[PDB]
């Protein structure tokens, strides 16, 4: 196996294929440049707001859920018709509906370490019981905001390494392959692919950010119930049930989530 | 294995190690007569509009035409979440059957079981067959999920009280269900409590008398799993009456997995 790049008319099937092959690809322009520009404006505008000027002439907040700080990531990047093409052939036949996992914004320091390689369902107990034939138990897109470089840190990964067992040890340093990206490009990072960040030994930093989503019944990283419920309603229904505002649907057509016995958007008026 | 009648003092591990040997057991007097009486009077008109059979279509054909499974136990009853989600029994067992794998728990549903006179048997099955990895579980791994089934009016072998097989816990994925000659009655008072794991085979039994069997339920699962029921439809001021341990439990804080990583957070 090895790293893919395809371009972003890439047939689904064909992105599929390559994900059960591989365990892992790049879709390049998988957004625009105008919708890299718009994420790191609105997430700046949030933890910072007030800039240093050039001269001497409530500053800062922590950051919260990527949904809250920024109304292109909740309205347009959750609402990805590649994103959820391939949630649903990963998720769809043997989970049903999935949502949300978990995202952040990725800033690599300039002089910072190389991450330990890992697979990102370590912390599900049930990948024990997983088997590398199995669907996988969560898939993270990760969008490039700089360009990706063997220099800045670019994310490495192990192509075929997702088919290991799970007591295999973790791949040796010199067998990781670089993803070298441009912004706009995404890297498709399922649970069972190895992967690190690599050390930035540049003077500037390495930004990028995530999505990542997993099926119905498993429990999310974040919620966002803390929302505003102004924020929830001007979300897509997709979106709504993304994060997780929705009742649920298992394969088997059970409805997690629910409220009571009827639907939680029905009982919240949404 | 066989079926348990216990008292309420029990030695917890002694209940732990039953459950591990004849994969269930019955909890007397697990709720005084107070308690059972102000959920009885709590929920009494909600399961009387209730209307009877599967609220909505799924897969598992198990919801008999003359039973009654309202769910929304907490919005409907205030001693069901500010006092039977506070049972120590029920916590002291999900520790030791949760903890030492999955970290934390929290609850994963919770129904009225009403038999109408007059309904036939429960096909009988596995709390845990809506889960899709409970075809990747082994019987030697811990359990998907447990339940708390309470009596509120007694339960006979005519009326249509919960029959379980004892041991079948024990039997692979690919086993098939018990047969009906091999089914046990709980035979319950208005109180004890039935501890039905994820893995135990069982069924309600037909109720043959004039009058209705009525129980509640209250089940649990680990951190990662997405529950059953949410409760975030709940009012606020519901919610600040909860105790912290009820607040985490119906999905208002934040849960710790084994190795201490932050879920729902
Ligand atoms: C379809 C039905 C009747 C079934 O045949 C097998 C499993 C489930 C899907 C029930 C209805 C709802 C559940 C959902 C819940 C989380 C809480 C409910 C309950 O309290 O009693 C039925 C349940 C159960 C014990 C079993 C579970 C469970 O674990
Ligand atoms: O009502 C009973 O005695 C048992 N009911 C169930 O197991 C159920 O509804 O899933
Ligand atoms: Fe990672
Ligand atoms: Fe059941």
Same mark, same amino acid.
């Given at each position: 196996?090895?790293?893919?790049?395809?371009?972003?008319?890439?047939? =689904?099937?064909?992105?599929?294929?390559?994900?059960?092959?591989?365990?892992?690809?790049?879709?390049?322009?998988?957004?625009?440049?105008?919708?890299?520009?718009?994420?790191?404006?609105?997430? %700046?505008?949030?933890?910072? /707001?007030?800039?240093?000027?050039?001269?001497?002439? !409530?500053?800062?907040?922590?950051?919260?859920?990527?949904?809250?700080?920024?109304?292109?990531?909740?309205?347009?990047?959750?609402? &990805?018709?590649?994103?959820?093409?391939?949630?649903?052939?990963?998720?769809?036949? $043997?989970?049903? %509906?999935?949502?949300?996992?978990?995202? !952040?914004?990725?800033?690599?320091?300039?002089?910072?370490?190389?991450?330990?390689?890992?697979?990102?369902? *370590?912390?599900?107990?049930?990948?024990?019981?997983?088997?590398? $034939?199995?669907?996988?138990?969560?898939? /993270?897109?990760?969008?490039?905001?700089?360009?990706?470089? *063997?220099?800045?840190?670019?994310?490495?990964?192990?192509?075929?390494?997702?088919?290991?067992?799970?007591?295999?040890?973790?791949? @040796?340093?010199?067998?990781? *392959?670089? =993803?070298?990206?441009?912004?706009?490009?995404?890297?498709?990072?399922?649970?069972?692919?190895?992967?690190? @960040?690599? @050390?930035?030994?540049?003077?500037?930093?390495?930004?990028?950010?995530?999505? !990542?989503?997993?099926?119905? &019944?498993?429990?999310?990283?974040?919620?966002?119930?803390?929302?505003?419920?102004?924020?929830?309603?001007?979300?897509?229904?997709? *979106?709504?049930?993304?994060?997780?505002?929705?009742?649920? /649907?298992?394969? /088997?057509?059970?409805? =997690?989530?629910?409220?009571?016995?009827?639907?939680?958007?029905?009982?919240?008026?949404?």
């Amino acid at each position: 196996p090895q790293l893919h790049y395809v371009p972003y008319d890439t047939p =689904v099937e064909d992105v599929m294929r390559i994900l059960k092959e591989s365990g892992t690809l790049v879709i390049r322009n998988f957004l625009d440049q105008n919708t890299v520009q718009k994420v790191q404006d609105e997430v %700046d505008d949030y933890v910072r /707001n007030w800039n240093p000027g050039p001269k001497y002439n !409530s500053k800062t907040k922590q950051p919260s859920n990527l949904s809250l700080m920024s109304k292109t990531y909740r309205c347009e990047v959750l609402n &990805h018709p590649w994103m959820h093409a391939i949630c649903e052939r990963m998720f769809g036949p $043997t989970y049903g %509906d999935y949502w949300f996992n978990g995202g !952040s914004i990725l800033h690599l320091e300039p002089g910072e370490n190389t991450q330990p390689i890992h697979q990102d369902h *370590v912390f599900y107990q049930i990948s024990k019981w997983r088997r590398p $034939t199995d669907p996988d138990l969560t898939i /993270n897109f990760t969008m490039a905001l700089t360009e990706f470089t *063997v220099e800045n840190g670019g994310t490495r990964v192990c192509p075929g390494s997702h088919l290991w067992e799970n007591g295999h040890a973790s791949p @040796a340093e010199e067998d990781m *392959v670089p =993803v070298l990206m441009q912004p706009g490009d995404a890297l498709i990072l399922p649970g069972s692919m190895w992967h690190s @960040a690599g @050390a930035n030994r540049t003077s500037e930093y390495r930004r990028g950010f995530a999505t !990542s989503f997993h099926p119905c &019944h498993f429990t999310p990283i974040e919620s966002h119930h803390h929302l505003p419920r102004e924020m929830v309603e001007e979300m897509t229904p997709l *979106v709504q049930k993304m994060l997780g505002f929705r009742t649920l /649907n298992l394969h /088997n057509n059970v409805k =997690v989530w629910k409220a009571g016995e009827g639907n939680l958007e029905d009982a919240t008026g949404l």
